[PDB]
Design a protein around this nucleic acid. Structure first.
Ligand SMILES: [Mg+2]
Lengths: 227, 358, 358, 50
DNA sequence: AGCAATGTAATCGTCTAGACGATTACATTGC
């Protein structure tokens, strides 16, 4: 049971976690995806923190192209039920599952793993103690959930927390079956092309700031904006 | 009644002007053909055609300016691509092209043109879209300069062709348009005093305005338009209607469009130039026809000077008239130069014929 | 993971170009069926095996019409331009490269329309198929017209009172007398046999002449003529010039008709195949105002009708100077006349016997 | 492994910083903090209050 | 309906790092 838990970057002192349900050239795919944000802080504080957490629906719906369902709180958490808009179950089946069993041979297809939970453990240490101040945590909810996207979550998981890569996938997935249907009169190359699109590095946020920058207004990145 | 300058140009003459020394006339074949006003006894104006190539696209409008109070004379002309082409004609004759506008402003197609004499020389010109600019002359070691002082934007949306313009003495820039709506402004205020329209209350059509001329005093305002198959003239006294000069048979003054018309020096007559070929002289009091000048191509037996066939093969026995002008006293030379007031005309068969009555 | 990409490469540049996926830039180019078949098969196989085994992001690079575009597969340009839906051009390219494979060995040409209707939900337009065909035709040093077994769809229609007989060594097609059918299709070798020419537009006046028919043949590409109609006219002239006489285009007065006629008359400096008999006797604005002396026919010029009328004045007069003598003199004068007059005529409602001599 | 910082990479390389209106990725308020100094600081903060 | 042209929008070179401006690109007129 392989699990990956990102190291605690002390920006305040918090952590993360990616749970995977797979069997152990790979392709990572969203489940069917709940993002937990338990604070673990040893008032209305929980209410306002949940307000900031739920203020990111505009991000999750206009940048990552997700679909929020529940903002339920299981007694400690501020989880967000997220269902992918691009990688729907129909697409998940059609792109990879059909050739993964129809063309049964030593193909070399990428073994698809999964991921469901992203449990963040942001633990603030207020200078005055129990009391806090509002709008003072925006450059703390924006310099963690943007740094984590920039550093690794766009490299090792370019299908679930990548803005531009998912944008490209939803832009060019329509002409993804007829481009191999006209190349080998089959659909063998669909998993290979879908893995190559994820493996592309020229669509991550790292190689996108450093360019000629013809178009300014994209990748707002100002998530968890105060209402 | 005067020496006709037949076959002047070879594509199509489109306008004419008078300067008491010059009779500048642009045309479609690119070059002006200024004619000296003063002949001696019988010298044909054909050898006096001091042509000078200006722009190969073509020319439609032309207007001059004479200031004698040391003898600075200018000639403005607009092309069929849209360009102000001032030409300071000195005196033999030299065509020094002048550049008084920066290239930055030169982005639109100017259409109309008319000079305004100083009582402070002024020139205005309408754009194809409908904008109307207003310059001001500062000639004053020697550097003529055209300076802007206003621009009366077309109120309508979408905007029309903005056919004609005027710079009347007291100041009323009657910017005609392609369907009524004769914009009226002020030279020192740039604020539209009125905004006229076609008094016609018939079905929706395209009744264009061909000419807008004022009175020497500054009271009357002649308006020439067409009811899409005829010619009509309705006065807009400073629109407010005074009357509709026409002829009995209906409500029309000509059998085709009234392409151009001009006022007189005393403001007591209104000559007309129609596509029907006649020159019917109106009056501001009786509003009745005075005389008719039918045109035909049989004045000279020899065919080398007269033009009767167009480029395609039809017979121009019925030539249209694009522009006529009036000359003040002592402008033309010859018999009856001082006792009579002369006028010039431009026809379809490319023949400029100066005229004189009585 | 940045642990190995940030602490070892330490430059803003020299990294976005080095740590870029290894792209196999593939050229489309490397006059017979077997040669093009083998080259296209080599392209398809080299793309397919590279995607399958080596996992290589392909980069299709080719040449376009000379006055360079590269279609990368995984949109691997590190510049997210808003206008970037580039995989719908690549999947049409690679889909036409499969229809070429499926149609070359049969040796029977297929029209563009059938190919489009086979996969309409993918191509989404019949213009896209033609656009991408005229690129892989050029990149293969093949003629756009004599090409890899893809043909036009016979837009132009001809009425002829005598059975003309084409002769193509693809065997002969035959236009029949008195049956307004489409112009038959043939390659650029046929010896056309007869057993005059009046060209029209809009198919409406043409249908009216078919209904009336009071030895004149009625060639007519419907809008702006197609390649088949121009080849038909050219070969008809060059094989039967001693029979036919008085070719005459017939378009209305809009500054569109003067371009439809110009299509038959003469193309740009690179004008290989054009009918040279195009004596353009069109319905001009001086031919409607003469018959207007028997919903108005005359329509005022808008901002498209004119903007395109003064673009055939700047274009025609670019190298040739003398307007007095030129084959485009008639076009330039008629083009200036519409701009000056501000009103365009029509030919649909003013049908008469002018089309015939009598 | 561990994540870097959005500005650590943004400042190691020479970015003209005007992307704040375009990318919104420039927050000047806080930066990366070493784990040892942060730990000792929070320990001192807790020890002061008792 | 097979071909074409206008209009503007977007990107691509130069010249002052962004801008503007002087160029191509393809969508939306059109017959
Ligand atoms: Mg038409």
């Amino acid at each position: 049971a392989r699990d990956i838990t990102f190291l605690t970057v002390f920006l305040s002192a918090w952590t993360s976690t990616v749970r995977i349900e797979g069997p152990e050239n790979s392709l990572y795919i969203p489940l069917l995806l709940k993002i937990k944000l338990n604070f673990k802080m040893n008032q209305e504080l929980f209410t306002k923190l949940r307000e900031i957490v739920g203020s990111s629906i505009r991000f999750w719906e206009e940048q990552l192209f997700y679909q929020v369902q529940d903002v339920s709180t299981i007694e400690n958490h501020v989880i967000l039920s997220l269902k992918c808009t691009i990688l729907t179950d129909a697409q998940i089946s059609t792109f990879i599952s059909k050739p993964r069993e129809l063309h049964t041979h030593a193909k070399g297809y990428p073994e698809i793993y999964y991921l469901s939970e992203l449990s963040t453990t942001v633990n603030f240490f207020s200078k005055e103690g129990n009391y806090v101040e509002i709008s003072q945590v925006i450059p703390h909810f924006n310099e963690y959930f943007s740094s984590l996207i920039v550093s690794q979550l766009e490299f090792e998981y370019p299908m679930v927390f990548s803005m531009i890569s998912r944008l490209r996938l939803k832009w060019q997935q329509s002409s993804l079956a007829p481009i191999s249907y006209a190349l080998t009169s089959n659909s063998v190359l669909l998993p290979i092309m879908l893995n190559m699109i994820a493996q592309d590095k020229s669509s991550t946020t790292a190689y996108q700031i450093l360019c000629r920058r013809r178009g300014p207004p994209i990748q707002n990145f100002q998530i968890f904006s105060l209402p | 009644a005067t020496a006709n300058a037949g076959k002047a140009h070879d594509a199509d003459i489109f306008s004419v002007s008078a300067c008491n020394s010059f009779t500048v006339s642009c045309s479609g074949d690119g070059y002006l053909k200024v004619w000296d006003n003063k002949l001696l006894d019988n010298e044909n104006p054909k050898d006096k055609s001091y042509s000078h190539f200006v722009h190969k696209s073509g020319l439609h409008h032309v207007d001059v300016l004479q200031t004698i109070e040391f003898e600075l004379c200018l000639v403005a002309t607009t092309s069929f691509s849209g360009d102000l082409l001032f030409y300071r004609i000195t005196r033999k004759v030299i065509f020094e092209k002048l550049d008084l506008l920066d290239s930055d402003m030169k982005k639109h197609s100017f259409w109309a043109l008319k000079w305004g004499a100083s009582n402070s020389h002024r020139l205005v010109a309408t754009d194809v879209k409908g904008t109307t600019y207003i310059w001001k002359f500062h000639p004053f070691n020697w550097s003529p300069t055209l300076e802007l002082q206003g621009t009366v934007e077309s109120p309508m949306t979408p905007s029309q062709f903005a056919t004609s313009v005027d710079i009347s003495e007291r100041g009323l820039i009657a910017t005609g348009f392609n369907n009524g709506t004769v914009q009226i402004s002020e030279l020192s205020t740039l604020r539209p005093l009125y905004n006229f329209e076609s008094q016609h209350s018939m079905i929706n059509n395209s009744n264009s305005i061909r000419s807008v001329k004022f009175s020497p005093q500054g009271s009357l305002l002649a308006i020439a338009h067409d009811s899409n198959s005829f010619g009509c003239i309705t006065l807009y006294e400073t629109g407010e209607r005074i009357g509709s000069l026409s002829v009995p048979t209906g409500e029309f003054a000509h059998s085709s469009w009234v392409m151009s018309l001009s006022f007189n020096d005393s403001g007591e007559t209104l000559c007309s130039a129609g596509w029907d070929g006649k020159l019917r002289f109106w009056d501001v009091k009786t509003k009745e026809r005075i005389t008719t000048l039918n045109m035909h191509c049989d004045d000279i037996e020899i065919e080398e000077d007269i033009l009767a066939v167009d480029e395609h093969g039809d017979s121009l026995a019925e030539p249209g008239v694009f522009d006529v002008k009036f000359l003040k006293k002592g402008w033309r030379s010859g018999m009856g130069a001082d006792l009579n007031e002369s006028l010039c005309c431009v026809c379809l068969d490319r023949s400029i014929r100066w005229f004189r009555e009585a | 993971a940045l642990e190995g990409l940030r602490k070892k490469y330490k430059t803003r540049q020299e990294l976005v170009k080095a740590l870029t996926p290894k792209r196999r830039s593939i050229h489309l180019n490397s006059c017979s069926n077997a040669d093009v078949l083998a080259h296209i098969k080599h392209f398809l196989s080299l793309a397919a095996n590279s995607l399958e085994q080596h996992q290589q992001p392909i980069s299709i690079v080719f040449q376009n019409k000379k006055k360079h575009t590269t279609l990368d597969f995984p949109l691997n340009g590190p510049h997210l331009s808003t206008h970037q839906f580039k995989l719908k051009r690549c999947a049409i390219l690679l889909n036409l490269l499969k229809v070429v494979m499926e149609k070359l060995p049969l040796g029977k040409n297929t029209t563009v329309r059938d190919i489009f209707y086979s996969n309409v939900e993918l191509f989404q337009r019949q213009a896209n198929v033609v656009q991408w065909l005229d690129v892989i035709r050029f990149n293969f040093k093949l003629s756009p017209r004599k090409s890899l077994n893809i043909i036009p769809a016979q837009k132009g229609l001809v009425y002829s009172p005598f059975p003309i007989d084409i002769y193509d060594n693809i065997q002969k097609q035959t236009i029949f007398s008195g049956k307004p059918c489409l112009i038959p299709f043939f390659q650029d070798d046929a010896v056309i046999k007869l057993g005059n020419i009046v060209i029209v537009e809009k198919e409406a006046v043409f249908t009216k002449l078919v209904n009336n028919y009071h030895n004149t043949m009625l060639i007519t590409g419907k809008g702006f003529p197609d390649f088949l109609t121009r080849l038909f006219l050219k070969k008809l002239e060059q094989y039967c010039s001693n029979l036919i006489s008085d070719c005459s285009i017939f378009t209305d007065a809009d500054p569109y008709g003067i371009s439809i006629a110009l299509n038959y008359t003469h193309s740009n400096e690179r004008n290989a195949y054009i009918c040279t008999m195009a004596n353009y006797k069109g319905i001009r604005i001086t031919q409607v105002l003469a018959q207007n002396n028997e919903s108005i026919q005359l329509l005022s010029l808008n901002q498209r009708d004119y903007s395109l009328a003064k673009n055939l004045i700047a274009s025609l007069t670019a190298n040739s100077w003398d307007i007095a003598t030129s084959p485009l003199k008639n076009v330039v004068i008629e083009c200036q006349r519409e701009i000056f007059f501000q009103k365009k005529a029509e030919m649909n409602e003013i049908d008469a016997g002018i089309f015939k001599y009598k | 492994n561990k994540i870097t910082c959005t500005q650590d990479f943004l400042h190691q390389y020479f970015v003209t910083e005007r992307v704040s209106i375009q990318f919104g990725l420039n927050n000047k308020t806080v930066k990366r903090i070493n784990k040892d100094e942060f730990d000792k600081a929070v320990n001192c903060i807790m020890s002061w209050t008792n």
